[PDB]
């Protein structure tokens, strides 16, 4: 039996019934900001409210309108509590504050009115720096960049990186408007060159993006890359690739050279549910990227990859989390041609398995007896000349594959040991990684001697302890890993530490 | 471009229904109206004694449906007259 | 502040004997030979058995925040290296930085400064050099900047 | 003393301002109009209208009061834009308004009646549109 | 620099005959001084 005053709302107590913070919510749900419920109940939904203003407090440095954007009530209309809680879920997927503190406030001039007030503390949003080396052995080498989320509190997202050096020279830019239209339609694009000495490209590419739902928007766009290489060491794999072309590499000699122009086509689809933008304790992320190549390209081919990872509480506090993450990534050839060799995936480091030296995880190179040379002393790979061998060279020098699949499950636990202006910034957990890298069109009956790389099942695994803290000059994460699973060539760091940002 | 990307709901004014608007009457005092309706939004700051109830409304999606009533007052507060737009025209 | 000590590998018994701070002993197994250590600030570190060497260092206070460490090691498989290392520190309302230096011999000389400000500016700066040696280095210098908001 | 005096000893009340030691001037209370800055979007000469006016507001509480009166009226007027293209055309109505009533001398003001001029004509509301545009053109110069 | 000592005059407003200008808030005002 429900009495008491149902502003024209009997249905929604009946359904709710068949209940102490629902009748609340509901009413929640339209202009009744203070109701009361006693309790078969007996409730007042009281009068309907309307918003007089939104301010806030604490935005210094970020551009008002970064946040106005974001809020879904709007002015001079009536009040939800839902359409205002999803303010701080909006604010806190952005990444540019320490907390979202909300509060309702009556205007003393009439019992009807309120004002909406959300109230925020900005953080450190990237870093500019710099650095430079010089010496007899060291002659000049010079590097810099910067890279910020938000520049100067505009809401653009940009970068500078780059360096000169004896050997390899290379610079990346890169802009992105998140809002270049009022409805959320986001631009940007990098241009960047890099000359590795031989190993010689530069390219550009600008896409587009937009949302079709509040938690899901897509992306696509164009791009062009040029490659030029040079003195390129005989490889099995890589002739093989540029055979494919109708290339035809002399026998055991490095004097050589190819280069390609390759327009491409880029795309994705993002879901994005998360609570929070640096420690979250809910929701999922799923990434899903890919480029095939336009005809009338010197290469065809397509890429696809898959990001996920998903954040599940097991306790009331939000502070117990397991968090699953996993990668898988596939890409082929088009036309009769292989994929080229330098899109390979690879896998190893903090960013993938925890344990292993970065991009040694999967197939190994494997050397022609090249011509015997007047480096065969001490200047090169004795089995890689015909001074030291005179048949296919096996080596440890990991070159990459066709297809990837890494997983790892991370058991995220609170460290209540130090003060808590050190706590809110450091989480740790405990972490089982593995992973696997093969290729395709390996012919191991040719190779009946060596290794078969098309066989996937041989998984690498490691397991051990992480640490991550939100330092002031940017996320660091520290670890140290113990591999369990090796196999012949594979190379372990058991004490690695790299940039928490990602 | 403009015909698929996602646009939330829009409201914006006085939320009104028929069973209320249909109270008013001429002769209700200012305070009877705006406890009946509840507070405007909108009023002439020239110097005009009237009120303006717009109810507004932009779904995504979809075109945009708009209703009002405009109610005009003498110097001592008497409501004086009462103007009705159901639709945009 | 003397008695006799021993511990079972695992196989092989090794066995000895402290006596009395700068405390020193011997030892022998079941690889003989003596040994010494001592903690003042300074340090002694001593070994020689049927392997050899010495550690030695000492530690003065020349101002509250400026010191000199004389140190010295030698090993044999005493033929090793010695020098002296000096520096300063600095500090203020929202900075702290320090200045380190020093000179051993193969002349072994290094310098520099490590900076910290507020909470996001870094800078710092070494370099090494050597002369009259077994070996030289005549440029050798690295620095790096950091600043972030 | 000299000031290098003063300054020595900070690092051992115009000292405070020298020194860029903000938490002690205002540890030792127009003086708050030193917090709406910033150093880096003042080299690149970025208008910080946009930003929190709290600390205008503060430090309002002789001609320097005029240019904190334009600092507030300037972010009222900022946000009356968004909303013109968001298209909140009630709140762009009540907060020109009130921008009109609380700073009818500022110049934002000037710059803004255009705002309902445009605001009256999507709502039909055609007498307000009409009256806009008369107090528009009267103050017109 | 001391920026505020370019701020422009501020002027007064009037309205056309028949209407008038909502009423000034109390608040902000700064009075005349020598």
């Given at each position: 039996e429900v009495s008491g005053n149902l502003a024209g709302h009997s249905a929604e107590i009946e359904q709710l019934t068949k209940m102490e913070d629902d009748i609340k919510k509901l009413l929640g749900?339209?202009?009744?900001?203070y109701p009361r419920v006693q309790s078969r109940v007996n409730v007042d939904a009281g009068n309907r409210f309307y918003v007089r203003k939104i301010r806030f407090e604490g935005?210094?440095?970020?551009?008002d309108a970064v946040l106005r954007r974001e809020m879904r009530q709007m002015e001079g209309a009536w009040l939800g509590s839902d359409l205002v809680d999803q303010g701080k879920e909006r604010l806190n997927?952005?990444?540019?504050?320490?907390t979202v503190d909300t509060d309702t406030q009556r205007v003393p001039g009439s019992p009807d009115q309120v004002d909406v007030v959300y109230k925020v503390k900005e953080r450190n949003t990237g870093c500019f720096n710099f650095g430079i080396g010089y010496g007899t052995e060291s002659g000049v080498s010079f590097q810099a960049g910067v890279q910020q989320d938000n520049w100067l509190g505009t809401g653009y997202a940009v970068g500078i990186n780059g360096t000169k050096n004896d050997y390899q020279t290379y610079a990346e830019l890169s802009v992105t408007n998140?809002?270049?239209?009022?409805?959320?339609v986001s631009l940007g694009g990098r241009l960047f060159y890099n000359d590795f000495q031989t190993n010689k490209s530069y390219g550009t590419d600008v896409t587009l993006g937009f949302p079709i739902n509040e938690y899901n928007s897509l992306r696509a766009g164009l791009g062009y890359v040029h490659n030029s290489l040079s003195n390129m060491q005989p490889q099995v794999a890589m002739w093989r690739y540029l055979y494919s072309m109708g290339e035809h590499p002399s026998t055991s000699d490095q004097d050589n050279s190819f280069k390609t122009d390759d327009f491409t086509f880029n795309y994705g689809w993002t879901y994005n549910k998360l609570?929070?933008?640096?420690?979250?304790?809910d929701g999922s992320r799923v990434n899903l990227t890919g480029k095939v190549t336009i005809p009338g390209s010197d290469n065809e081919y397509y890429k696809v990859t898959l990001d996920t990872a998903t954040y599940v509480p097991i306790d009331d506090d939000h502070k117990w989390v397991v968090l699953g993450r996993t990668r898988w990534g596939y890409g082929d050839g088009l036309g009769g041609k292989e994929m080229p060799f330098y899109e390979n995936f690879y896998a190893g480091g903090s960013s993938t398995?925890?344990?292993?030296?970065?991009?040694?995880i999967g197939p190994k190179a494997v050397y022609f007896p090249h011509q015997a040379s007047n480096?065969?002393?001490?200047?090169?790979?004795?089995?890689?000349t015909q001074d030291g061998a005179k048949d296919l060279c096996k080596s440890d020098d990991a070159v990459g594959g066709n297809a990837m699949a890494v997983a790892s499950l991370e058991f995220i636990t609170p460290?209540?040991?130090?003060?808590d202006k050190y706590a809110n910034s450091v989480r740790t957990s405990f972490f089982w990684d593995m992973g696997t890298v093969w290729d395709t069109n390996w012919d191991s009956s040719q190779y009946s001697?060596?290794?078969?790389?098309?066989?996937?099942?041989n998984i690498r695994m490691s397991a051990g302890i992480a640490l991550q803290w939100m330092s002031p000059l940017g996320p660091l994460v520290f670890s140290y890993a113990q591999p369990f699973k090796k196999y012949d060539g594979d190379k372990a760091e058991q004490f690695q530490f790299n940039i928490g940002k990602t | 471009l403009e015909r698929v990307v996602y646009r939330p709901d829009i409201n914006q004014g006085n939320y009104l229904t028929a069973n209320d608007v249909?109270?008013?009457?001429?002769?209700?005092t200012q305070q009877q109206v705006a406890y009946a309706?509840?507070?405007?939004?909108?009023?002439?700051?020239?110097?005009?004694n009237t009120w303006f109830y717009v109810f507004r409304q932009q779904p995504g999606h979809e075109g945009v449906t708009q209703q009002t009533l405009t109610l005009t007052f003498n110097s001592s507060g008497v409501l004086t007259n009462i103007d009705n737009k159901p639709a945009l025209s | 502040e003397a008695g006799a000590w021993a511990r079972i590998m695992s196989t092989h018994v090794q066995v000895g004997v402290d006596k009395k701070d700068l405390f020193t002993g011997f030892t022998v197994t079941h690889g003989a030979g003596l040994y010494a250590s001592a903690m003042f600030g300074a340090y002694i570190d001593l070994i020689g058995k049927y392997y050899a060497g010495a550690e030695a260092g000492y530690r003065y206070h020349v101002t509250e925040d400026a010191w000199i460490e004389p140190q010295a090691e030698l090993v044999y498989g005493l033929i090793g290296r010695t020098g002296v290392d000096v520096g300063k520190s600095f500090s203020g309302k929202d900075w702290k930085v320090t200045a380190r230096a020093g000179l051993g011999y193969q002349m072994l000389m290094s310098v520099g400064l490590n900076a910290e400000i507020r909470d996001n500016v870094r800078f710092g700066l070494e370099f090494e050099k050597s002369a009259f040696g077994k070996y030289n280095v005549d440029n050798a210098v690295n620095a790096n900047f950091r600043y972030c908001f | 003393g000299n000031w290098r005096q003063a300054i020595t000893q900070l690092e051992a009340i115009y000292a405070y301002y020298k020194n860029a030691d903000l938490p002690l001037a205002q540890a030792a209370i127009?003086?708050?109009?030193?917090?709406?800055?910033?150093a880096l979007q003042g080299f690149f000469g970025v208008?910080?209208?946009?930003?929190?006016?709290q600390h205008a507001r503060a430090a309002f509480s002789t001609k320097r009061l005029v240019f904190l009166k334009d600092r507030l009226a300037k972010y009222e007027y900022s946000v009356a834009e968004y909303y013109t293209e968001r298209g909140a055309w009630v709140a762009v109505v009540n907060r020109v308004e009130g921008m009109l009533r609380d700073?009818?001398?500022?110049?934002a003001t000037r710059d803004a009646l255009p705002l309902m001029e445009n605001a009256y004509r999507q709502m039909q509301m055609n007498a307000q549109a009409e009256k806009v545009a008369k107090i528009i053109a009267a103050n017109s110069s | 620099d001391e920026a505020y000592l370019e701020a422009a005059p501020l002027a007064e407003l009037h309205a056309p005959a028949g209407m008038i200008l909502p009423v000034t808030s109390g608040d902000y005002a700064i009075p005349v001084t020598n």
């Amino acid at each position: 039996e429900v009495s008491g005053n149902l502003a024209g709302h009997s249905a929604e107590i009946e359904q709710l019934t068949k209940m102490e913070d629902d009748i609340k919510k509901l009413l929640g749900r339209y202009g009744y900001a203070y109701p009361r419920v006693q309790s078969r109940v007996n409730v007042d939904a009281g009068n309907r409210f309307y918003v007089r203003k939104i301010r806030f407090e604490g935005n210094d440095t970020s551009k008002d309108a970064v946040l106005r954007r974001e809020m879904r009530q709007m002015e001079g209309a009536w009040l939800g509590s839902d359409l205002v809680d999803q303010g701080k879920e909006r604010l806190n997927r952005l990444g540019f504050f320490e907390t979202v503190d909300t509060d309702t406030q009556r205007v003393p001039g009439s019992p009807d009115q309120v004002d909406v007030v959300y109230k925020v503390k900005e953080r450190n949003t990237g870093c500019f720096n710099f650095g430079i080396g010089y010496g007899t052995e060291s002659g000049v080498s010079f590097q810099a960049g910067v890279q910020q989320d938000n520049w100067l509190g505009t809401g653009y997202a940009v970068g500078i990186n780059g360096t000169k050096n004896d050997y390899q020279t290379y610079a990346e830019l890169s802009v992105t408007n998140p809002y270049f239209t009022v409805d959320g339609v986001s631009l940007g694009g990098r241009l960047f060159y890099n000359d590795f000495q031989t190993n010689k490209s530069y390219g550009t590419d600008v896409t587009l993006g937009f949302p079709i739902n509040e938690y899901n928007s897509l992306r696509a766009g164009l791009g062009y890359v040029h490659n030029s290489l040079s003195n390129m060491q005989p490889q099995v794999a890589m002739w093989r690739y540029l055979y494919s072309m109708g290339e035809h590499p002399s026998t055991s000699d490095q004097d050589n050279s190819f280069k390609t122009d390759d327009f491409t086509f880029n795309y994705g689809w993002t879901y994005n549910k998360l609570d929070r933008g640096y420690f979250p304790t809910d929701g999922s992320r799923v990434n899903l990227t890919g480029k095939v190549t336009i005809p009338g390209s010197d290469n065809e081919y397509y890429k696809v990859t898959l990001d996920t990872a998903t954040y599940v509480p097991i306790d009331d506090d939000h502070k117990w989390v397991v968090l699953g993450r996993t990668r898988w990534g596939y890409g082929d050839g088009l036309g009769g041609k292989e994929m080229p060799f330098y899109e390979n995936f690879y896998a190893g480091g903090s960013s993938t398995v925890r344990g292993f030296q970065s991009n040694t995880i999967g197939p190994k190179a494997v050397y022609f007896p090249h011509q015997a040379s007047n480096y065969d002393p001490d200047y090169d790979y004795e089995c890689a000349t015909q001074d030291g061998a005179k048949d296919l060279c096996k080596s440890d020098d990991a070159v990459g594959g066709n297809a990837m699949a890494v997983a790892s499950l991370e058991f995220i636990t609170p460290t209540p040991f130090i003060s808590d202006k050190y706590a809110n910034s450091v989480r740790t957990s405990f972490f089982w990684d593995m992973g696997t890298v093969w290729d395709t069109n390996w012919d191991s009956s040719q190779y009946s001697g060596y290794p078969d790389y098309s066989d996937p099942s041989n998984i690498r695994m490691s397991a051990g302890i992480a640490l991550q803290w939100m330092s002031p000059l940017g996320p660091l994460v520290f670890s140290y890993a113990q591999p369990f699973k090796k196999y012949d060539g594979d190379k372990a760091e058991q004490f690695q530490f790299n940039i928490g940002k990602t | 471009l403009e015909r698929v990307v996602y646009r939330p709901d829009i409201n914006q004014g006085n939320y009104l229904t028929a069973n209320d608007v249909s109270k008013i009457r001429v002769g209700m005092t200012q305070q009877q109206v705006a406890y009946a309706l509840g507070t405007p939004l909108m009023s002439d700051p020239f110097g005009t004694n009237t009120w303006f109830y717009v109810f507004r409304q932009q779904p995504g999606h979809e075109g945009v449906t708009q209703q009002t009533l405009t109610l005009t007052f003498n110097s001592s507060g008497v409501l004086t007259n009462i103007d009705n737009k159901p639709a945009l025209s | 502040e003397a008695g006799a000590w021993a511990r079972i590998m695992s196989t092989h018994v090794q066995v000895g004997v402290d006596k009395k701070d700068l405390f020193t002993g011997f030892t022998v197994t079941h690889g003989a030979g003596l040994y010494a250590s001592a903690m003042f600030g300074a340090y002694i570190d001593l070994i020689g058995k049927y392997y050899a060497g010495a550690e030695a260092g000492y530690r003065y206070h020349v101002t509250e925040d400026a010191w000199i460490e004389p140190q010295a090691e030698l090993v044999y498989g005493l033929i090793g290296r010695t020098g002296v290392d000096v520096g300063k520190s600095f500090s203020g309302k929202d900075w702290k930085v320090t200045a380190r230096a020093g000179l051993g011999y193969q002349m072994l000389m290094s310098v520099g400064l490590n900076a910290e400000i507020r909470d996001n500016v870094r800078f710092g700066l070494e370099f090494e050099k050597s002369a009259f040696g077994k070996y030289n280095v005549d440029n050798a210098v690295n620095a790096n900047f950091r600043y972030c908001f | 003393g000299n000031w290098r005096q003063a300054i020595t000893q900070l690092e051992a009340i115009y000292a405070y301002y020298k020194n860029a030691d903000l938490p002690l001037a205002q540890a030792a209370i127009l003086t708050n109009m030193a917090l709406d800055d910033s150093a880096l979007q003042g080299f690149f000469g970025v208008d910080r209208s946009d930003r929190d006016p709290q600390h205008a507001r503060a430090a309002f509480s002789t001609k320097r009061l005029v240019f904190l009166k334009d600092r507030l009226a300037k972010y009222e007027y900022s946000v009356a834009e968004y909303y013109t293209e968001r298209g909140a055309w009630v709140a762009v109505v009540n907060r020109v308004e009130g921008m009109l009533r609380d700073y009818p001398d500022t110049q934002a003001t000037r710059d803004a009646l255009p705002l309902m001029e445009n605001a009256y004509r999507q709502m039909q509301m055609n007498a307000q549109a009409e009256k806009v545009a008369k107090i528009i053109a009267a103050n017109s110069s | 620099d001391e920026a505020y000592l370019e701020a422009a005059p501020l002027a007064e407003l009037h309205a056309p005959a028949g209407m008038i200008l909502p009423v000034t808030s109390g608040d902000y005002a700064i009075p005349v001084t020598n």
